């Protein structure tokens, strides 16, 4: 109830939200099965002051495309002409069911990077992603909105 409604409002307005507050809300969210992620999603970030957030923004990161369990485009970006293209220099990705803090949910795993994004449901068209990247002292959060 509460966590979903509070997170939906932040995600829909593109507002920033500090790591500790998102994590509290994320831990109360329900896991999602792998096929729930299938489709194209528009992405946004909760903390835009982070290094990788800065780099995603500079690349005009749009979102992600989940084709099937084995074929995911993790970095859809917007080119200067306005069209959306799949940036593939960091490699592609796939979906598996992975645990995070005792909760097993659909997670995107990069093929060529030690990065896993743990997804939890906000509503049918919104998920919060928890980025689990090797070395990173803390889990970082981002959001996805389903294209309809």
Q: Which sequence spans correspond to the domains of the chain?
A: 2-148
Sign of the four-CA dihedral 109, 123, 44, 31: negative
Work out whether the CA dihedral 94, 108, 61, 131 comes out positive or negative: negative
Q: CA 77 to CA 82: how far, in whole Å?
A: 9
Question: At a CB cut-off of 8 Å and minimum separation 6, what does 77 contact?
Answer: 59, 60, 61, 62, 84, 85, 86, 87
Residue 19's Cβ-count burial label (10 Å; 0-12, 13-18, 19+) is middle
Q: Which of 130, 126, 128 is nearest to 100 (CA)?
A: 130
Separation of first and last alpha carbons in the chain:
24
Q: What pairs with residue 142 in β-bridges?
A: 45, 129
CATH architecture of 2-148: Beta Barrel (2.40)
- Determination approach: X-ray
CA separation for the pair 22, 130 (Å, rounded) = 10
Q: In which residue are the tokens 């994320």 written?
A: 26
Rounded Cα distance between 20 and 52, Å, is 18
Under DSSP, the state recorded for 111 is S
φ and ψ at 38, to 5 degrees?
A: -60, 125
Kindly state the DSSP code that residue 34 receives in the 8-state scheme: G
CA distance 148 to 39: 9
Q: Name 53's Cβ contacts closer than 8 Å, sequence gap at least 6.
A: 45, 47, 140
Cβ atoms of 125 and 148 closer than 8 Å: yes
HSE, side-chain direction, 13 A CA sphere, residue 71: 3
CA 80, CA 16: separation in Å to the nearest integer? 25
- Please give the Cα distance from 49 to 8 (Å, whole number): 21
Give the integer Cα–Cα distance in Å for 65 and 41: 6
d(CA 119, CA 43): 13
């Amino acid at each position: 109830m509460d966590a979903e409604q509070r997170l939906a409002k932040i995600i829909a307005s593109g507002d920033e939200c500090d790591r500790a507050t998102v994590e509290e809300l994320y831990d109360r969210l329900a896991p999602v099965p792998v096929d729930f992620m299938l489709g194209t999603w528009r992405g946004g970030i909760f903390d835009r002051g982070d290094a990788l957030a800065g780099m995603l923004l500079g690349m005009n990161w749009y979102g992600k495309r989940f084709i099937d369990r084995d074929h995911v485009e993790p970095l859809l970006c917007r080119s200067p002409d306005g069209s959306i293209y799949s940036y593939e220099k960091l490699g592609l990705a796939r979906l598996r069911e992975v645990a995070l803090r005792g909760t097993v949910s659909a997670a995107m795993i990069y093929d060529k990077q030690p990065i896993i994004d743990h997804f939890r449901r906000v509503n049918d068209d919104m998920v919060v992603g928890a980025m689990d990247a090797k070395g990173q002292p803390d889990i970082l959060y981002f959001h996805l909105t389903r294209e309809r």
